[PDB]
Symmetry: D2
Subunit: 251 residues, 4 copies
């Protein structure tokens, strides 16, 4: 019987690249989404076309609130409901926008979305994953290679990703006696929005040592797939940068 | 005019030592506290006896909630209303208890307290402090030298301290243009409670390379004093471990 | 035509596992060795029995000296001599013994062996590798140490050597990225405890590891190397992958 | 009796400022130097004019070689010879120049860059410990060690090694009451002779004040680490960089 994976924020971009890759490697997948309903269902469609009854979608807001623990438990429950098991959890969903310290979402909303999606939801999904448990159980957290050279005025976002590093380590340590490995993948710049000005994209592209290009979504997913594989059976609490050397470039 | 400082969680233990040492150095102080009202008032009394009109108290819960931004604004305000200025903020208050991943406060309450006290309140206090501004302005965040080798079952506490590192770096970068430095002090083991077990204290003491003892509250306060001083005027985004070598000791 | 890899200290243990997997993946290999001459020659024999003239041996002391630069150049040269190309370099060879700060090799000899093997020879091999250079996939993997920030008591020069190696991994990734050469590390925690260590002692270390209360196999370390040299790691450079079972996360 | 400090590479620039500050604090000082004899003697003279018999010079090359351990032992020995004790060691001496991967031989590059930045600090540390009250060592590291300058691999390997020495020695010497810490400068005291356009280019990158560190600012952190206010601090490295290491590309 095939193992099952939950991928948060999997309707598009990096998260969809990860979902697809697990599916192709033989996983059944829960495609989680928040707002992108049409993209999520469309992907579950493709993948079920490929193999019937191997994908489902699951809608959840991962903003922090008093019901977030229930929402995270229901995401995990939804994998068991659909597949009878849950082998892999990939915490990919993330809010990203500036929250300047000195001067519109209220600050309470900004805290809730940025810390919720990047850190607390990952923690709650990890609790639920562990609680509901031959096997290769693992969690992969999507981190950020630039957390120590942060974007100006992204304090909440940066605190959220730092918290996620802390979760990755704490969960690796705690869940090792249950056979559950917990690792991260830390993109540098990846998948630049089409919208973004072509000269702005080139400005950033030119900073990357390896090929003066951003990472493809495929390249990020490749590192996730490694960490979930039997090729990584002794790896836990590791975070693999996938950044083309960007984090090494001084100002 | 003497400079003024806010110290969170200043009624007892390390926060109290930081408040005393700053007051000794010539600062006027706001003693924030949550439950330790008699100790906070007694400290204020003792400090005002040394020097009239140099200490006030401010009570607030720093748990994450819809009212935390106003509470943090209140705390900074208390310093302006008493003293007419606010030069230094020390983010010392901190909830600390285990939050095991595998199963009595609800989990969402555990999240609110541990992430609120250790990260979100320090972010909101930082915003409020910055917004209100040859001065020597700075922020010192009490971090944790053991954050990369965390205690088992302390996930949320560790996440909170990692976020606080993230805040330290982000805010150092963003507030540098205003002349506000942001730094950290990372204690190892300091001031073990009297009522904790003798076997367990001996166990931990014996692990510290430098002297086989915990730090005194005054030794932690010494590093805070340095960072706020004119001897640290080029230092921002730095985190000083005060751990007797404990973090260097392998398992 | 098949790519080619140099693996230093490849006669035994982890280096041997790395050479074997690389060869199994389709690489031709230079098995570098220092003292383990029989092991190196019998390994090359086993590999060539599988595929003809896909393995050669190359002996060199990698202690720091006046002759180390030429030795390192000759290791890379031997790969070009045998196989016409050199696509991968794995810096695995390493001296490891204590050098207490406070009180019969002299200290200058300990410096030369520990800093030479762990840091200087990798630098020189990296220079020679790069100097000699869209289906190209060139890369270097340096064998680091997951416990570098919580070092063994009395192992200052070894630990200095491994820190220098992290520095090289970063500096060389930055500098060689324009040439298409990636530079990464694999950082074991405890792996393949020596056969002659008593099991009761092996178990004292084993017991510290969160993930299974055992040490890594040589093949588990090799698996990380294989990943880093693969096409699945094409945007990965300057990265160090811990393969430590969570050991570095465990407090005193 | 006043305590005594050894400061390597102390004839000029940042090492000189550290010596000056330790001397102002009440230390007797060994000013080690390699080539800057005139500056070193002039400094010793000035410090002894301020307080008699409180400074000496000591000449040594700290390039790696088979005699480096004896040279390091002799530096520590020179502090005991002059002052009867040795309380503080500051490993400041450092070679710094590019060594690209693609007149000096590479053997010589390795010897100077790895010797000065790492092996000499290790040997000096051994000699300091062996010869033994608030005893401590401060190693001058580099806040940019993880975002290094292009083509500076050996320099960078040296400073990484020095971080490892700081940790290993803090761990090992702690039972002897000897603390070991680091100060990691960002851009500091730019050469007067360096091009103004280039200086301005690097200055404008620094978040805190858009200026380099003064040598006195670096020294202030050294002074803290050797003081009685840092008696529980060992194995720590304090960046003194105005936030420069926080700035992405
Ligand atoms: N792109 C980069 O350059 C880069 C750099 C560093 C790190 N990373 C990391 O890699 C991961 C993926 O990057 P990306 O660019 O693909 O991400 P993205 O496009 O910014 O967002 C990924 C998904 O997160 C989900 N999400 C956002 N807010 C949410 C909420 N409140 N509740 C639930 N889900 C929410 C969204 O789902 P819906 O669309 O369904 O609403 C969105 O599709 C992230 O964790 C990111 O931080 C990316
Ligand atoms: N002690 C150590 O070994 C150690 C080690 C590493 C880091 N640290 C850090 O150093 C700092 C001082 O340590 P400590 O041992 O002195 O801390 P502590 O005694 O655990 O707590 C300090 C104060 O935090 C305040 N606090 C707790 N929950 C709060 C809430 N919901 N709202 C507002 N305030 C709250 C409390 O004030 P009230 O008493 O008034 O209720 C408490 O007295 C902390 O940031 C800690 O995390 C300490
Ligand atoms: N084993 C572990 O737990 C562990 C932990 C952390 C990191 N690592 C790293 O992983 C790598 C492999 O570990 P290992 O335990 O397999 O290594 P090892 O058995 O200690 O030695 C590897 C090889 O290094 C070669 N070597 C030693 N001194 C040399 C010299 N002076 N010149 C040239 N070559 C020399 C030896 O070759 P000959 O036998 O031919 O003389 C030896 O076979 C090393 O880089 C190590 O530091 C290992
Ligand atoms: N300046 C910066 O921006 C910066 C940045 C990061 C770190 N740092 C660190 O801070 C420390 C001081 O920096 P700096 O700019 O003052 O240093 P510097 O001017 O480059 O050199 C300091 C001294 O090192 C001594 N030295 C060099 N090679 C030597 C050798 N082979 N043997 C013995 N001594 C040798 C020289 O002595 P003589 O003059 O007597 O020959 C020189 O005066 C260094 O450790 C440096 O790495 C500085
Ligand atoms: N969830 C999430 N989304 C991100 N982005 C979504 C819009 C483009 C970037 C980033 C992102 C970025 C970026 C970026 C950096 C330089 C130039 C353009 C984009 C970093 N972490 C992120 N996390
Ligand atoms: N707010 C807060 N409080 C802490 N403590 C309050 C009770 C003593 C420890 C710690 C603490 C600790 C500890 C400790 C660790 C090992 C042995 C004994 C105490 C670490 N971070 C903390 N943060
Ligand atoms: N070249 C080299 N060799 C190592 N070893 C070779 C013999 C066993 C370990 C180690 C090693 C180790 C170890 C070890 C630690 C605890 C228990 C047993 C082995 C760490 N880095 C190493 N580098
Ligand atoms: N021993 C030593 N000396 C350095 N320098 C001596 C004169 C120029 C800088 C540096 C140095 C530098 C620099 C610098 C950075 C930006 C612009 C100009 C110089 C970094 N590490 C150093 N170590």
């Amino acid at each position: 019987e095939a193992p099952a994976a939950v991928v948060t924020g999997a309707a598009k971009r990096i998260g969809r690249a990860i979902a697809v890759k697990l599916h192709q490697t033989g996983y059944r997948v829960v495609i989680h989404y928040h707002n992108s309903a049409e993209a999520a269902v469309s992907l579950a469609d493709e993948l079920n076309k490929e193999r019937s009854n191997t994908a489902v979608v699951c809608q959840a807001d991962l903003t922090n609130s008093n019901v977030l623990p229930a929402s995270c438990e229901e995401i995990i429950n939804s994998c068991f409901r659909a597949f009878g098991r849950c082998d892999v959890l990939v915490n990919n969903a993330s809010a990203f926008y500036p929250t300047p310290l000195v001067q519109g979402k209220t600050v309470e909303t900004q805290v809730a979305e940025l810390i919720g999606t990047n850190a607390i939801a990952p923690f709650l999904l990890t609790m639920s994953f562990a609680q509901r448990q031959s096997s290769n159980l693992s969690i992969v957290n999507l981190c950020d290679a630039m957390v120590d050279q942060p974007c100006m005025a992204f304090s909440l976002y940066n605190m959220g990703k730092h918290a996620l590093v802390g979760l990755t380590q704490s969960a690796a340590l705690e869940l090792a006696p249950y056979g559950i490995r917990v690792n991260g993948v830390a993109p540098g710049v990846s998948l630049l929005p089409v919208a973004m000005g072509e000269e702005e994209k080139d400005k950033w592209r030119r900073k990357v040592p390896l090929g003066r290009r951003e990472a493809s979504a495929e390249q990020i997913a490749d590192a996730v797939i490694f960490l979930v594989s039997g090729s990584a059976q002794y790896i836990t609490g590791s975070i693999i940068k996938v950044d083309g050397g960007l984090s090494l470039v001084h100002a």
